[PDB]
Ligand binder design. Structure first.
Ligand SMILES: Nc1ncnc2c1ncn2[C@@H]1O[C@H](COP(=O)(O)O)[C@@H](O)[C@H]1O
Ligand SMILES: Nc1ncnc2c1ncn2[C@@H]1O[C@H](COP(=O)(O)O)[C@@H](O)[C@H]1O
Ligand SMILES: [Mg+2]
Ligand SMILES: [Mg+2]
Lengths: 499, 501, 501, 499
């Protein structure tokens, strides 16, 4: 009945969708872990998985140096699901044949189900002209599975792929050549569920409410009646951590909030108000705007500024951490993605969770929706949003302008449309407004992206009229700003942030 | 395990969203019934609700004979949740005072939580300047509630609405002046869940899987070993009914499928093949195209065409029912909304009578049906009989099937199919200079029709992308021999109707 | 000054732009005529041109007995300007060479000027670092000119075309492989002007004002004091003819306006009131709606309908004519293109026989006619008779006549009228359901047709804005009792036509 | 022949359209001058106008000290034509009644001709249902004319404006409440032609060819055989001035071209090659890049930079003037709008001309179309386009980056779609090309506006496709640039240029 009882082991062969697969299983209410393919029978059997999923991977199975699944995987006695590369490698290691091809395929297709299988019985999206089941899927196949292991049957086929789905109903081995984890596969979720809950027989115990109970229980057994310290950044991870700890150990939790004077408009106030006033947490608020600024004085180098900011934060925190008596633990908002890729113990209650799961438990814990589902803010904050040397004047101008930008983005039902959106301050002067009495004022640049790939972002084609409303506002109401420009650079060639 | 044990009762005061409240509760996994507000205590006691919800309504509690909830509602000893008007009448009937108002608020607002309540505890959408809780809601208040009953407390307020949420935690009576059932209320579902699951303590047993098992058990007990007949139209309700009846009684089910020559391209083949060959259902196939067409020969009045098609259908179905022996029951795909509306030799088996259409589709999926068939835009009863203007002729019917097929194929490829409530083609018996190739001096015309239905009285013509429109237009004229021109319906509802006949 | 004195002769080799060449010369204020390439030295000598232009053409000089310019063209002693094929025939006839090739070219290019010429001197769109003038031109060449006559020089060149402009300055022979008559050649009008005004030494005497004075003179000379009759149709040619004659002979002119009941909203009265009340012309108004509709009753075929309307008009007009005494002349609004095309009891007066349509419009304005009437998109001769598909009934005419007025009013009200080539409404003889407020169920349908002409063979259905369309259909259905629905034609040309029938 | 014999006097009451009115009169082939309304009778008399036009103006005849046409205007014996406020003050001053209104009308309307007038006889755009004459006009109704002088007749009316056109055929006074100079008024031009040519009896002698002859004759009369010096900039006005002077005095003209180092890519070469070789002009080339940069070094204030550049140019030019023997005249390309807005005499051949007229005569004199119709280039060049300190290094990077921008615009057929288009150099750095490129390069901004009024310019909504294409070119091609941004600031609140 422990929520980790039934679990899925997912072996990563390098696909870009592997974390997506793991996240989907979590969404279905089943715990799972994601490991690299190069493991041992020892590890695997130590884990004791209810079922194993082999992901996709860019490499070719026809290669001599190409990755394979540990033979124990197929000997463990639990269902296995191969996705693309996982399906190819499954064929290889079991008797099938595969040969390479220069041109690869990746896109929507409709496959026809020609045989009954536990995995897809009753799951059909469309019908052929003669009433045969078709599944709309998101294909992905490089190598050519020319033959499958003798034990298997052909479950589904399509023009560009005769073995679109293969299965061994007795051994419970299934392989597909499309991605069920991508929404393009219309009934993909339903296929993953079929395997995880029906075939592997896992109950849906991994739900936000149960995750919270388990976390609280664990924090209690680890920390007992000891005191814990935690740095509150105002961000998502540390905020949810603060709530979990507050729930588990109450008055033994002390939080430290360092105000470096590099945060957004009203950010410091809202953080202390919500946490200290509304929730009643004990917060040590350090007003260090001066300490950070004086340490940044005359520094134009971005590498340098970041280092300075990071160093001074540790000095301030360590100082405070030393003023507290009987503190035996440091709490941290570490999340699973981080794990995947004085002398105080370390408490990390979010360690097994994906960002999306953290938002869900955050809500259940009573945190505001808007704070949890907002765009990320860098660690150095406005320290890198201000090009060159950082002065208070600039930061004050910047947060006012960025506030207006964000206000209008949410108001224009556009905030959820962009992956990230910020304002950069340009240390240059141009002809200004007739009210400020300033001939020349400072300049700012808006930056909205659409991170298509983890390494490839697109510059947001924000509506012209929208941009014009924004531009007018920032120049009119934010005294000290003459004009506004918009970043029309993608990644590549440019980077998302300027520094 | 009785999936109907925990149940919610929803009294309708006339709100446009009442059925929507009922569907959210079914989505949450709890059985519920929707009734008119004018009921008796005896009826409520019979139902024995685990909780009660008083919907919104266009009326005013200040009016002399305005609707009111039966008083037993507040004496049943179960939780009560009043939405908008249901909140206003709860105030009035328990000691509060409402004030009449002509100007009414209906739109997005942020209310500030100022007191604790089991209803909204832990639910926050944003923060005020001092970090106090805010909820993003879809407000709706006509008259001005000026005083809540003495035993209640203000849970949340707003500028124009002093008492946005009121509660009597001891009695478990809550009233909100906004609609949690609409998506504009960011955490509305969570609030409905708080009420149905936590406060009313209802288990969530009303799921697609258990609903099927329940339906089957009921079918087996009511029909036993009798033979049952069903008219298979290929539509959603009859298709799901067929699958449920099949699972329950197997071989004792006989489906009668009548091909009236007014269905779409390959529709009759797909139905016959999927049902008979794929699923193994016992189907009596009646090829009746000629019989329907002859009957429609020379009829121009659409009012008459409708009457004819319906008339010939009953004849045919009856003729077939008479050829079968020992058939004691007639199965029908009647759904809950048909019953609610009707509330406003052979016995009858109605397996879907308690379900809303979205639930029917969910169970259809579980039963193995194709997604595209279940989520297909509605198709009129007399089919293409009302899609072909005036006299229906086989020639016109086959041309229309061809053009319609292209129009739908393209909509799907373009990810536009689900962007419209309905989309079809109408055949116009008018001449347009023929296409060089077809060899005719003149060919026919078809009109594309696509709308976004706002409500059952308002629908807007879809602003489909010009390139898409030119692509379809081109394909139809070039591919369907016999059609030389394509037009697009730019008439909305009102003043025009969705269908042309 | 005789405005016909200095004139240009244009030989037509079959280009779609030949009339455009002629129109541009007219715009430069010089009289010109367009003849077939197959003429004699004798005919050319009688005309005595100050210059000669050889137009483009789809044929090939390499083919046996292909078109050639009369050799007198190159011996006349006047400048000659050959355009595309005309330049190729120039090269072939004077000692150059052309290689056949089916790989044609029709598009934008920049030619580089490598030598001085009276034709391009001081005319350039840009310069090259090299120091050479550049001309942005609309190229067009199929066959490949491999050699120019030994006495010619290469004036300009481009990658794909080494001899883009050739010339013999002494003889004043010039040839280009681009069309300067199309606006795509930025400096084209400028080149044509250098040739016409500077090289051929032709002063600009052919202007609207002077054309009017010349026409009036010629009319008074021909008709003298006789009486003239003219049928007023409401169109451009007869209207300008009317005003011209009114100015020439005043009271001696009698106009006959036959009211066939097939005109637009308020048209017949505007004609009568403007020409009668405002300009004071003698107008015999002949009511003939009933005569036309009776003769149109039961007629469905478009070709038949066209024949009927034309027949009845001749009948009505001739009857009214015999009723008149002393009339010895019938005035007609024949324009130059009618004559050009034709090239393949009482006298006839035709004051517009030398003018192109755009010249007729310019003189109309000078004569005081309304701009909108003159620059109006084309209206068919049989009018509504063909816009009302099927049998022409008065009820239908009056319905179309109203729906169209609104469509047009809205186009103009939205400054969209000038953005389309043609725009009109078609009456569909099919009914539709819907009019809620009226309580009326089945009414007629109309189709809106708006296109953008790209070429004589190709036209695009206009991408008119959605809200403009919604506005129009809304007004139409609501303001025209009898119309329940409005559709919009989304058929391009090809595969479809502009007019329906 | 005297092409100045017949001329129209135009009195400006402050409308943005007044200059457009003068231009229309020149287009019709008649000479005219634009003056401010506040002149005396002696001045008007000295001008001896053939006709007088009274323009619009934002004011209202109702305010006490409101602009009034000088009384003589109505007593000169020549026709008078009032437009909008010009009509209003005409009504007022001659006896009609007008009355203030808070709101003002500006849009399309149709006015019905109710009476015959020399101004509108034979001019009609549409017909009423009764076949009565209508004119489609661009209505601009400010105050309300509630009455007209006793000797005037209503010529046209509209519901919302009873006195759309008023006339006194006897005295030849006409007033309209719409703008004939705008194309929205269908036959507006024919109305102006009717006034200027028929009613005023003015011949159309003000033509490009006749103006050229008149100019050459005046230059010769003013200069004789004296030598003339002219600064050749490569811009439209100096180029047309040089060609005029070349035609008038040949070899006696020496053009001095100063390369200040703040010019565009290959501009210097282009000017010399074109005017020197192609047109055969005597050019004195002055390479002064180092003299300008040294004087610009260190300086960062734009007001200071423009001043330095102007100073050093006079220094360089004067030095050369002194080196030349027998130079008695300095020729300048001053044009009419400028006027409306060892020592030697001035020769200003283009002083009476508007910019569009200068262009038509330029084409006549053989200059290329694209150079005559190119967007304006600031006298300070890249000096005010390289923000802050100007370094050759920055100007060099900018030319390449701007060359690509204009190259792309011309191709996409967008160049003639905007009034101005340039690139600005921002002295701020950003992260550069990944892997093999530079880590920290500079940033540049694109700027493209569509001028709506002299003090009003909208930022061009350039296509997203185009903007992306350009950003890419500049970044990867221009070595030293890493980010391209687009100025989204209209005017107001911002200016067109940055310095
Ligand atoms: N302003 C701050 N005050 C206190 N702790 C902070 C602050 N900023 C960052 N931290 C801590 O640094 C951790 C990492 O932040 P991030 O850089 O967003 O991953 C947060 O989870 C906090 O525990
Ligand atoms: N309704 C009519 N009444 C009088 N004359 C007409 C009428 N329709 C056509 N005509 C005459 O026939 C000529 C042919 O014009 P259309 O057929 O419109 O090109 C017109 O210019 C008139 O001279
Ligand atoms: Mg005609
Ligand atoms: Mg200048």
């Amino acid at each position: 009945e422990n929520i980790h009882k039934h679990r899925i082991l997912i072996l990563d062969f390098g696909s870009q969708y592997t974390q997506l697969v793991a996240r989907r299983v979590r969404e279905l209410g089943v715990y799972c872990e994601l490991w690299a393919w190069d493991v041992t029978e020892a590890q695997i059997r130590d884990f004791n998985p209810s079922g194993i999923i082999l992901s996709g991977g860019p490499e070719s199975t026809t290669e001599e140096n190409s990755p394979r699944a540990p033979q124990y995987v197929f000997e463990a006695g639990v269902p296995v699901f191969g996705v693309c590369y996982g399906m190819q490698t499954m064929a290889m290691q079991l008797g099938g044949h595969v040969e390479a091809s220069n041109e690869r395929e990746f896109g929507y297709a409709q496959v026809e189900v020609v045989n009954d299988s536990a995995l897809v019985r009753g799951i059909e999206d469309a019908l052929t002209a003669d009433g045969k089941p078709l599944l709309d899927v998101w294909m992905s196949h490089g190598d050519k599975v020319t033959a499958i292991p003798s034990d298997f049957i052909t479950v589904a086929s399509t023009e560009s792929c005769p073995f679109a789905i293969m299965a061994n109903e007795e051994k419970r081995f299934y392989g597909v050549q499309f991605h069920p984890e991508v929404t393009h596969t219309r009934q993909g979720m339903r296929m993953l569920e079929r395997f995880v809950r029906d075939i592997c027989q896992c109950e849906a115990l991994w739900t936000p409410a149960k995750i919270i109970d388990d976390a609280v229980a664990r924090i209690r057994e680890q920390v007992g009646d000891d005191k814990v310290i935690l740095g509150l950044s105002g961000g998502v991870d540390s905020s949810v951590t603060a709530m979990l700890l507050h729930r588990a150990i109450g008055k033994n939790l002390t939080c430290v909030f360092v105000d470096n004077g590099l945060l957004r408009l009203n950010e410091a106030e809202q953080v202390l108000d919500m946490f200290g006033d509304h929730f009643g947490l004990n917060i040590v608020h350090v007003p260090a705007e001066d300490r950070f600024l004086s340490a940044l004085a005359g520094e134009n180098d971005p590498e340098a500024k970041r280092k300075i900011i990071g160093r001074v934060f540790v000095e301030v925190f360590d100082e405070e951490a030393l003023k507290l008596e009987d503190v035996k633990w440091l709490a941290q908002g570490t999340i699973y993605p981080d794990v995947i890729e004085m002398k105080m113990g370390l408490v990390e209650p979010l360690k097994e969770l994906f960002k999306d799961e953290v938002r869900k438990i955050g809500l259940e814990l009573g945190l505001p929706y808007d704070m949890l589902y907002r765009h990320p803010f860098p660690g150095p904050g406005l320290g890198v949003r201000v090009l060159g040397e950082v002065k208070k004047e600039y930061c004050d101008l910047l947060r006012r302008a960025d506030a207006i930008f964000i206000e209008e983005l949410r108001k224009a039902d556009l905030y959820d449309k962009v992956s990230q959106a910020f304002t950069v301050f340009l240390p240059v002067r141009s002809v200004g407004v007739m009210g400020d009495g300033r001939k020349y004022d400072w300049v700012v640049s808006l930056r909205a992206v659409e991170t298509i790939d983890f390494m490839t972002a697109h510059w947001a084609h924000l509506p012209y009229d929208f941009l014009g409303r924004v531009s007018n506002r920032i120049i009119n109401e934010v005294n000290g700003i003459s004009r506004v420009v918009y970043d029309i650079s993608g990644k590549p060639p440019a980077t998302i942030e300027w520094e």
